[PDB]
Design a binder for this molecule. Structure first.
Ligand SMILES: *[C@@H]1O[C@H](CO)[C@@H](O[C@@H]2O[C@H](CO)[C@@H](O)[C@H](O)[C@H]2NC(C)=O)[C@H](O)[C@H]1NC(C)=O
Ligand SMILES: *[C@@H]1O[C@H](CO)[C@@H](O[C@@H]2O[C@H](CO)[C@@H](O)[C@H](O)[C@H]2NC(C)=O)[C@H](O)[C@H]1NC(C)=O
Ligand SMILES: *[C@@H]1O[C@H](CO)[C@@H](O[C@@H]2O[C@H](CO)[C@@H](O)[C@H](O)[C@H]2NC(C)=O)[C@H](O)[C@H]1NC(C)=O
Ligand SMILES: *[C@@H]1O[C@H](CO)[C@@H](O[C@@H]2O[C@H](CO)[C@@H](O)[C@H](O)[C@H]2NC(C)=O)[C@H](O)[C@H]1NC(C)=O
Lengths: 236, 236, 236, 236
C-alpha cells in the first residue's frame, strides 16, 4: 500500500498472503477454517497460502502454511479481459471474487482468526482500513512488514467520473481525494474493513497508485453473500 | 531501446508504430501495402497504425495513419500465459507473431516502404539492428525520437543458461553480454535487422533491460515464412 | 556516491580517505589532530589515511599522508557477521563505529580541519550531505574527484519496512524515496552532515545504490558521544 | 563458471548445491551417503543441500533435498581471514575444506552418486573439469543450468608468481593462461576432476574471474585424505 504504516503485530489476524509457489502474488481474507477469499484476477495454476504472517520475507514460527485443493472464481468475472494488454473503454470488472478451499483446515489461534461477512450496507463517509504487502512505491517495491492505510468510502459517482471502465453496483469506491494514500500492485484480494467490519476486497486502481482525485475500486461484499455461502455449503 | 541512438531521419520506412486510442503500445514491420507484422502479445481489441513516423509527439505530414480490419495471431502462441499473474518456470513463449490486415492500403512514398522476409538463415556473430520507441530507461520513459541500436546475434545457449522459460528453435538470442544495450518495454513487435536483412521481431527480454549476461529473445522469422505467406495469400 | 556532484574544492577539510596499501577502501571523519572516525566494517590489518584530498589520482601537496598506530572498533559491533557468506534475516548491524589513532598528528591547515561531534539530536525532514569516493555507478566505478550529495533524513520506519535486518535507535534512515541519490560501495565511514552539523556516518544501504523506496542506514552518532570521548581521553 | 557450457543432463551426479536456507551459496561434492565435501570458507549458521540438481531455479522431481546435522571445518583454515575486508599480502588460505554430515542418508540412484577420493597425485598439463552454478559474468549473474568448463593443471609456480597470497603444497593451480575460462563467485567447494578423477575443490581466484595470466587456486585433495577419512569414521 502507498502512504500507509506498519500494522501492529498480529492486529489483522484474517489477513492472508497468497502465493504461486515461492512467490507472493496477492492478499486474501480468511473466512472459515477451510475457506479463504481473494480476487478472481489473481490467476495462476496452483495456489499456496500463508496465515499469521507479519513479515513477508522472514519465517515466523507462529505462522501457518497451507495448500489449496480447489479454487472457485465467481462465474461472473470476465476472464477474457486478462489477455488484454490495454483495458478497453467501458470494460466491466465486476465480480472480482474467488474462493480457495484449503486442503488441510487451519488452526484458529491468537495469531490466526477468520472475519465475519458483512451484514450492513456500506455507508459513504466511512473510515476504512486497507492492508497488504503490495508495493510501497506508486510505480514496484514490496515491504517486509504488512502495511495498513486508512481511507474514506466515497460515492460510486466519484469513481465513475474518473475511470473509463464501468463502475457498477457490485463495486465500492474509496481512497483519499488528496491522493498519496492508496492500495497498490499486489494488494489485490486484500480486505477493506470499514468501522470495524469487512465491507469488501481490493480489486483495481489508478496507475500510478494514489493518483490525486482518482479513488480505487473494491468489491461490494454484501452483494455476494449468497453466492459465497452457497459455494461453501455446497462444497464439502 | 536502451543504450541506442536517434535513428537517422526516415532511414527505417518499415518501422510501424502500433497505437491503441491516443497511445503507442508496440512496434511492427511493414511487409506489404496492406499487411503489418507484430508480436502476438500486443493484444488489444482495436488496432491503429502510424507509418513514416520519426517523432512520437509530432504531426508529420509524410506520415500515414490507418486502421486494422482483421488481426491474425499465430495459432501456436499460448494466449493462456497472458492471463497468468506470474510466469511459471518452463513457460514456452514460442510463436510470438501476429499479422494485421489494414483497412485502407498504405501509399508507398520514400518515407513508407516495406521490407522482404529472409531466405538466408541467421548465423551467430552477426551484427543486428533493432529500433522502436520503447523505454530508454531500463525500468519507464518513452522517447520522442525513434531509437536505433546495434547488438550481436548470439547462440541460443547464451539465453537458455539464464532464462527459466524455454528457449526454442523458433527463437533467437541477441544482445550484448556486457550489458547496457538492449530492447526494452514497448519495443515488442519491432524489427531485428541482421546484416541489412530482417531476421526477426522483438519478443521479450530481461527486466531490467540491458542486464549484463542476460541477452533478449526474438522470433526466428525464417521458421514462419510458409505460414506468413499463406495467411496473406489465403485470406485478405 | 550516486547522483551527486563534485564537491567544491577544499570545502570538506574533514573528509578522510582511508587507504590500504595503494588503494582507497573507505572514508572517515577528522575529529582531532590525532583521531579519525570510520566504520567498524572497514576491517583490514594495517591502516593508512590521506587528508586534504580532492582527487584520488593526483599528488596534492596541501594533502597530508599519515599512518595509524592503534584502531579501536566499538565493543558492540558483532564482527562475526563479517565472516558469514550471507546476511541472515534479522542480523543486527548496530554500533558500526571505529576510531583510528594516528602515528603522527595532523597539521591543521585551511585544507585539513576537524569537525565537532553533535549535541543537537536529529529531526526528520532535515537536509543532509554525504560525500566520498564511493562508486558513482549503482553496481562499480570510483571517481577521481570527491563527490557530494544532498539527501533527506527520514524516520526509521521508512528503512525498517524494507530491510530484513534490524533497524535500531542507534541508526538513522536517510536518502530519497524517489531513488537516484544515495551513498554507494566504499563510501562507508564517511560523514553525514545535517544542517551544517555532523549527525552520523555511512554504515550501509541497498544494492543497487539509490534504489527507489529503499533509503540507507547511518550511525546515530549522538548515541556514541560518551564512548567516543572516553576512548580518546582514556587511551592515547 | 565463466566461459563454460551447459553440462550434460545428470553427467555430474556428485555435484552438490549448498544453501543457507533458500539461498544458494556454494558448490559441493558428494563422497558418501552421509557426507558432503565443500570449502571451509562457505561460512553460515545452518546448512541445507540439494543433490541431483541440473536447474538451480527449477524444481526437478529426481532431485534430493537434505538437512545437515553438523559441519567439520578443517582445523587448519584460518577463519580470522574472513573478517578482513582486504586480503593482507602473504595471507595463507591453505586447508580450505569442510565436511557436512547429512541428517538423513541420501539415496544413491542414477541421478545421485558419490565420487571416490583420489589415489594418484595430480600431474601438471592434465585436462581438468570444473563445475557449478557460480557467476557466469566475471563481475554477478548466476545461471539456471549447471555449468562445466575445461581447464589445465599448471605448476604451482605459475600461481605463486601472480598472487600476493601464499601458494602452498596443499593447493593446486589451474586455469587457462589465455584467460576467459575460470570458475567464479559461488563456485566455491565445487569439484575439480582431472583425467576422470577428483583431484581437488574450488577455493579462490582472480577478481575479475578468468583474468588472463592469473590461474585459480584449488585444494590439493590427496594431502587431506587421512583427515577426511579419520573424520568420517570417527563421527558415527
Ligand atoms: C498454456 O498455458 C497454460 C497456463 O500455464 C497451461 O495450462 C496449465 O496446464 C497444466 C497441465 O499441463 C494444468 O495442470 C494447469 O492447471 C493449467 N492451467 C490452466 C490455467 O489451465 C497450458 O498447459 C499451456 N499449454 C501448453 C501447450 O504449454
Ligand atoms: C469480456 O471482455 C471482452 C473484451 O472486452 C468482450 O468481448 C468483446 O465483445 C464485443 C461485443 O460485446 C465485441 O464487439 C468485441 O470485439 C469483443 N472483443 C474481444 C477481444 O473479444 C466480452 O463481450 C466481454 N464480456 C463477456 C461476457 O464476454
Ligand atoms: C590468521 O590471519 C590473521 C590475519 O592475517 C593473522 O593475524 C596476524 O598475525 C600477525 C602475527 O603473525 C600479527 O602481527 C598481525 O597483526 C595479525 N593480524 C590480525 C588482524 O590479527 C594470524 O596470525 C593468521 N594465522 C593464524 C594461525 O592465526
Ligand atoms: C553475532 O553474529 C553471529 C552470526 O550470525 C551469531 O551467532 C549465531 O548465534 C546463534 C544463536 O543465537 C547460533 O545458533 C548460531 O550457530 C551462531 N552462529 C555462529 C557462527 O556462531 C550471534 O548470535 C550474533 N550475536 C548477537 C548478539 O546477535
Amino acid at each position: 500500500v502507498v502512504g500507509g504504516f506498519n500494522c501492529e503485530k498480529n492486529s489483522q489476524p484474517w489477513q492472508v498472503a497468497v502465493y504461486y509457489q515461492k512467490e507472493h502474488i496477492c492478499g486474501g481474507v480468511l473466512l472459515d477454517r477451510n475457506w479463504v477469499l481473494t480476487a478472481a484476477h489473481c490467476y495462476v495454476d496452483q495456489y499456496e497460502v500463508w496465515l499469521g504472517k507479519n513479515k513477508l520475507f522472514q519465517e515466523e514460527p507462529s505462522a501457518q502454511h497451507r495448500l489449496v485443493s480447489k479454487s472457485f472464481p465467481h462465474p461472473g468475472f470476465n476472464m477474457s479481459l486478462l489477455m488484454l494488454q490495454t483495458i478497453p473503454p467501458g470494460a466491466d470488472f465486476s465480480d472480482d471474487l474467488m474462493l480457495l478451499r484449503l486442503s488441510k483446515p487451519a488452526d484458529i489461534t491468537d495469531v490466526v482468526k477468520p472475519i465475519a461477512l458483512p451484514t450492513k450496507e456500506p455507508k459513504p463517509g466511512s473510515k476504512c482500513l486497507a492492508s497488504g504487502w503490495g508495493s510501497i512505491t506508486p510505480t514496484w517495491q514490496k515491504p517486509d512488514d504488512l502495511q495498513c492505510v486508512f481511507i474514506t468510502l466515497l460515492p460510486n459517482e466519484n469513481c465513475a467520473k474518473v475511470y473509463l471502465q464501468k463502475v457498477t453496483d457490485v463495486m465500492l469506491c474509496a481512497g483519499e481525494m488528496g491522493g498519496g494514500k492508496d492500495t497498490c500492485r499486489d494488494d489485490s484480494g486484500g480486505p477493506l474493513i470499514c468501522d470495524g467490519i469487512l465491507q469488501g476486497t481490493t480489486s483495481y486502481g489508478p496507475v500510478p497508485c494514489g493518483k490525486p482525485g482518482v479513488p480505487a475500486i473494491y468489491t461490494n461484499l454484501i452483494k455476494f453473500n449468497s453466492w459465497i455461502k452457497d459455494t461453501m455449503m455446497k462444497n464439502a
